[PDB]
Amino acid sequence: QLGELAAAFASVPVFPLFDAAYFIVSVLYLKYEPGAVEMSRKSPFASWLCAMLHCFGSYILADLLLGESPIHYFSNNSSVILATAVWYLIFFCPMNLFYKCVSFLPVKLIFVAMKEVVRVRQIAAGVHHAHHQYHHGWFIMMATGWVKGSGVALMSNFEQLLRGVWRPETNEILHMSFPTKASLYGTVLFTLQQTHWLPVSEANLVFFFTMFMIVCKVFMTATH
Amino acid sequence: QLGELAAAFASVPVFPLFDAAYFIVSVLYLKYEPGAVEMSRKSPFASWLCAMLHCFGSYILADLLLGESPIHYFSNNSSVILATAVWYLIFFCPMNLFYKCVSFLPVKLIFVAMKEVVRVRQIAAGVHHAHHQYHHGWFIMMATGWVKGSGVALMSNFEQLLRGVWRPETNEILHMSFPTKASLYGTVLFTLQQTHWLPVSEANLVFFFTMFMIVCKVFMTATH
Amino acid sequence: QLGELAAAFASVPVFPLFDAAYFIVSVLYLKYEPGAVEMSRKSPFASWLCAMLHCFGSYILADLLLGESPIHYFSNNSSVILATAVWYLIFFCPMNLFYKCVSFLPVKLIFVAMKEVVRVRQIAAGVHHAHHQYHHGWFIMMATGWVKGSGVALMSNFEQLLRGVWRPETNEILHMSFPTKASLYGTVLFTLQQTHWLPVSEANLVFFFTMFMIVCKVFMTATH
Ligand SMILES: [Ca+2]
Ligand SMILES: [Cl-]
Ligand SMILES: [Cl-]
Ligand SMILES: [Cl-]
Ligand SMILES: [Cl-]
Ligand SMILES: [Cl-]
Ligand SMILES: [Cl-]
Ligand SMILES: [Cl-]
Ligand SMILES: [Cl-]
Ligand SMILES: [Cl-]
Ligand SMILES: [Cl-]
Ligand SMILES: [Cl-]
Ligand SMILES: [Cl-]
Ligand SMILES: [Cl-]
Ligand SMILES: [Cl-]
Ligand SMILES: [Cl-]
Numbered sequence: 001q002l003g004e005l006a007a008a009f010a011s012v013p014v015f016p017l018f019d020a021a022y023f024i025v026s027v028l029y030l031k032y033e034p035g036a037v038e039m040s041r042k043s044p045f046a047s048w049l050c051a052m053l054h055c056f057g058s059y060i061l062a063d064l065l066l067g068e069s070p071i072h073y074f075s076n077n078s079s080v081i082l083a084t085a086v087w088y089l090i091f092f093c094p095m096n097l098f099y100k101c102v103s104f105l106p107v108k109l110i111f112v113a114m115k116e117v118v119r120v121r122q123i124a125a126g127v128h129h130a131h132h133q134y135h136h137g138w139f140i141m142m143a144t145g146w147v148k149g150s151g152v153a154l155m156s157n158f159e160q161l162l163r164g165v166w167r168p169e170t171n172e173i174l175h176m177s178f179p180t181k182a183s184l185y186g187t188v189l190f191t192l193q194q195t196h197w198l199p200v201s202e203a204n205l206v207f208f209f210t211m212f213m214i215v216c217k218v219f220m221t222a223t224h
Numbered sequence: 225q226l227g228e229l230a231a232a233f234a235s236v237p238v239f240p241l242f243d244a245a246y247f248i249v250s251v252l253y254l255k256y257e258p259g260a261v262e263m264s265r266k267s268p269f270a271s272w273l274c275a276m277l278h279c280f281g282s283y284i285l286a287d288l289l290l291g292e293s294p295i296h297y298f299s300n301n302s303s304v305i306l307a308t309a310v311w312y313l314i315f316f317c318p319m320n321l322f323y324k325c326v327s328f329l330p331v332k333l334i335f336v337a338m339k340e341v342v343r344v345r346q347i348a349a350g351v352h353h354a355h356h357q358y359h360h361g362w363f364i365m366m367a368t369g370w371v372k373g374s375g376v377a378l379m380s381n382f383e384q385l386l387r388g389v390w391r392p393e394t395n396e397i398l399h400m401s402f403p404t405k406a407s408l409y410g411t412v413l414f415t416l417q418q419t420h421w422l423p424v425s426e427a428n429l430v431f432f433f434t435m436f437m438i439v440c441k442v443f444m445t446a447t448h
Numbered sequence: 449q450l451g452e453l454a455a456a457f458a459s460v461p462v463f464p465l466f467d468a469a470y471f472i473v474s475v476l477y478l479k480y481e482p483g484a485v486e487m488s489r490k491s492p493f494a495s496w497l498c499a500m501l502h503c504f505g506s507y508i509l510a511d512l513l514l515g516e517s518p519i520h521y522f523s524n525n526s527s528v529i530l531a532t533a534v535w536y537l538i539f540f541c542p543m544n545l546f547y548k549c550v551s552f553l554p555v556k557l558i559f560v561a562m563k564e565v566v567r568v569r570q571i572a573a574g575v576h577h578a579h580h581q582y583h584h585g586w587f588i589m590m591a592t593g594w595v596k597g598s599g600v601a602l603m604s605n606f607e608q609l610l611r612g613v614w615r616p617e618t619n620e621i622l623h624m625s626f627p628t629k630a631s632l633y634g635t636v637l638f639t640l641q642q643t644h645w646l647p648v649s650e651a652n653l654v655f656f657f658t659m660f661m662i663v664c665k666v667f668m669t670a671t672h
Contacts, residue, residue: 039398043397043398043399045397045400045408046397046398049397063291064518065517065518065519066517067291067511067515067516067517067518067520068291069289069290069291069364070288070289070291071289071363071364071367072291072364074361074363074364074367075358075360075361075363075364077360077361077362077363080363134523136523136525137522137523137525138525139519139522139523139525139528140517140519140520140522140523143519143522157609161381161392161395162395162397162398163398164392164393164394164395164398165392166390166392166393166614168609168612168613168614169612169614170612171609171610171612173491173493173494173497173610174487174491174494174610174611174612175491176493184493263622267621267622267623269621269624269632270621270622273621287515291515292515293513293514293515293588294512294513294515295513295587295588295591296515296588298585298587298588298591299582299584299585299587299588301584301585301586301587304587385605385616385619386619386621386622387622388616388617388618388619388622389616390614390616390617
């Protein structure tokens, strides 16, 4: 009955709880970036735009690669408003209280685990969407799933540009961080499962690859 | 009969006179930029391309956001040729005569007023076009109208790159100039009018918001 | 019977031999770039991506200008794999043997000539494709044919960014190299032939303009 558990696991509604956790962890990372708090005070619109890149960069990059509107996902009003609320609470909550609660390590690890659930689903969805337009476009499936999982990291040079920062000597392709490298392995696995060359159900691969990401990310977050 | 006046005002043919005024003021601003005259002499093709960004950047950015060909508007041969003539006359007219005439303050203020007529129509058109593709895409309507009104300012970092200039420490989002900020207020107003939450006719909002832009821009141009 | 020869010349199958020659010459140029060998060792994925830009940048830029998926051409699995093989053999062949063979001047000049065959066909194809979407879009035809022939040169600033290099003081538009300038002349000629204002068959223009590019490029390669 393991496949029955995997089917329920791979079909959990990511909206709104799992998307919120994704938004919280991502906007938390934004606040850690140099000058982010100063930017929220002096340039609140650019600060919000930065947070939307962190929350939705996966869809912005996938749509760009597939020639679709890069802000197509912003037609999802409930998601945009929910991410906007997370940005506001993290940067402007009185007593900084929301930050204090979601930074509590037991609470933060849970949100980190829930974000990985969303990232794996995102990779698989990117592969399947590209496949729908290109039945044998293996390289297009791999590219789309990769940017769906990496998110804002693959546009980090230009996320920095928006913030008034320019560091051209490195980029996430030249030197991949773990989530970028892991999303590349993930997109190959999901593309191989799409090819029917990897003899495993789509629900089992989602389950096992998410558990891999959850263990890695929770361990990396608890260590530092 | 104020609505009868507003209907005639909001439906005046922008081509070719009002578009020409837009092109003149924009290419004048280009000539004010550092190295612009030198660039027209040594790199005349890049100089013309820069002028096309100033004249058509509104359509280039809107089409990019909506996933349409970024040079789609360049199929409008008469408009492209008219902007090309304005660029040539401003940079290469014997005796610099065309520049002298259009820089005459009474003449320049009129062209500045006529450009604002075109900008407001552009914002409204961006909102209505996004709405046609996304009936409830409020954030897509706001983004499209914003870039239609801001024009080349929102791509200023890359207009500078084309010119051989790189100033990453600032951008029009991080620090909005008045036309960028005003186009953001404008696009919210036109989106609210699209939502039917703002109880005002589309022709009246065009009239009153254009008069607001005309007074502000004429006053700002005459002061300096 | 010159038109009978020109028809056979303009319809030769570019895949796979003529495309391979294009890939070889382009990836050779990549290896000449500063830090390229070091990058292939430390960042092999970015190195491969750079080589794909050199091999396919024509299609990436044309698709971008026309609002189509920028990686649409990567659905051509055989072409992508063939370019990947060329990249691997040039950077990782034991004894560097593949490099030694294709760098042999008599062999290199032939590959240089065959690449020009592919470039001219690319320019003409860009013009005809834009024409199909815009029957009278002269400026769109010219832009599309231009980027099809110039290839990665028009994205050189961002090919450098991928490599960790940033040199904003120059770009291929501000200062055109010979292949960029020649592709601009070529796209005007093919657009004029599309307009029916240039009284010459499409096969004759391909033949004569390719011979022009072959003589120029072979002479430029043999001189230095
Ligand atoms: Ca598109
Ligand atoms: Cl940073
Ligand atoms: Cl602001
Ligand atoms: Cl998704
Ligand atoms: Cl997707
Ligand atoms: Cl098919
Ligand atoms: Cl400047
Ligand atoms: Cl030039
Ligand atoms: Cl418009
Ligand atoms: Cl529009
Ligand atoms: Cl609908
Ligand atoms: Cl370089
Ligand atoms: Cl790598
Ligand atoms: Cl082609
Ligand atoms: Cl094409
Ligand atoms: Cl038509």
